Design a protein around this ligand. Structure first.
Ligand SMILES: CC[N+](CC)(CC)Cc1ccccc1
Ligand SMILES: [Mg+2]
Ligand SMILES: [Mg+2]
Ligand SMILES: [Mg+2]
Length: 340
């Protein structure tokens, strides 16, 4: 039963869950990869990795992906969670230099991953492995777009490091802008493309219905994470959360803030339903009787289908994953799965 404050009856009724058939293999393969790359201690992998549901989250999202593509995505996704944990620990322990050096290595590795496959920092080596595999599916133009997007993401994490060290809580609009980067909206949007086997031309992926449907799917993901992760984040002195920007800067109570975040999330869903009709119409228009048109139509339809799947995968992930079960931790400020 989903806690009442978090429950979204529209998701439960109108966004039925899907699961990619490769999921059982995926779960074990990513577990093995976390182990082999030493991204988590073996005992924490054993006790917590499956319960974190990171592979489940991606297998409920990129339906239709080739198994090899889904594997690279899931390994990268598990890496991303461990990176969020590393960032958090560097902030909590005041390791500004370790963070600055990591920030610089990730920018460099992102451009030349094969050069970093055996880097001394296992977090950099794990990143490089997943990124080198992601760069082997589509043309270099897609790789460069992924890289452009993730450089921006790394810098947004750097801004978060400074806000948290300086005790600054961003304002609402400042936060909303920053959250499109820290949630990595455009990375997940880029990854729709190797999942359906096609780098989309700019004229297609920048069509306003495709752009808007893509944006709303990610706003939902980010803001619903804010709603569900708020208790862990308060306990951990995290300042980045739409709710916190509202408590801090609009004098809402915790209760009023949870309500406003929920209202924003609900409205995302019904705005998505409207634009989804336009995006699927566009998918239809592309099928103009030509071979290329059929290819583009098929890829856009699959991508818009997965933009829809992200809602249900994210919703259930937050209720299933150990990552947010702060009530179960002996020390609420120190999740058990993090390297402290
Ligand atoms: C809960 C999702 N997350 C975690 C750091 C924040 C919104 C981004 C993410 C999405 C998909 C894969 C890995 C990380
Ligand atoms: Mg976090
Ligand atoms: Mg974070
Ligand atoms: Mg969060």
């Amino acid at each position: 039963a989903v806690p009442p404050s978090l429950r979204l009856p529209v998701i439960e009724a109108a966004f039925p869950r899907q699961l990619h058939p490769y999921w059982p293999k995926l779960q074990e393969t990513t577990r093995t990869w976390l182990l082999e790359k030493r991204l988590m201690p073996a005992d924490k992998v054993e006790e917590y990795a499956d319960g974190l549901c990171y592979t489940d989250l991606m297998a409920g999202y990129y339906l239709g992906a080739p198994d090899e593509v889904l594997q690279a995505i899931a390994d990268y996704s598990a890496w991303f969670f461990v990176w969020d944990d590393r960032h958090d620990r560097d902030i909590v322990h005041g390791r500004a230099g370790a963070w600055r050096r990591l920030r610089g290595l990730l920018h460099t590795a992102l451009d030349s991953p094969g050069d970093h496959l055996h880097h001394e920092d296992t977090l950099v080596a794990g990143f490089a492995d997943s990124v080198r595999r992601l760069y082997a599916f589509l043309p270099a133009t897609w790789n460069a777009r992924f890289a452009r997007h993730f450089h921006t993401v790394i810098e947004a994490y750097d801004r978060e490091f400074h806000n948290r060290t300086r005790g600054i809580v961003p304002g609402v609009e400042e936060y909303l802008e920053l959250r499109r980067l820290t949630a990595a909206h455009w990375i997940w949007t880029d990854l729709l493309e190797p999942s359906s086997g096609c780098e989309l031309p700019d004229a297609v992926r920048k069509h306003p219905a495709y752009r808007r449907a893509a944006l709303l799917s990610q706003e939902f993901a980010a803001w619903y994470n804010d709603l569900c992760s708020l208790p862990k984040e308060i306990a951990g002195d995290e300042v980045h959360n739409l709710g916190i920007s509202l408590i801090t800067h609009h004098s809402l109570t915790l209760e009023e803030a949870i309500g406003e975040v929920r209202r924003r999330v609900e409205e995302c869903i019904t705005e998505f339903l409207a634009v989804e009709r336009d995006a699927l119409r566009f998918a239809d228009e592309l099928a103009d009787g030509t071979v290329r048109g059929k290819e583009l139509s098929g890829a856009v339809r699959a991508n818009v289908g997965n933009m829809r799947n992200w809602f249900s995968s994210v919703y259930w992930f937050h209720h299933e994953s150990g990552r947010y079960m702060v009530d179960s931790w002996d020390d609420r400020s120190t999740p058990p799965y993090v390297n402290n």
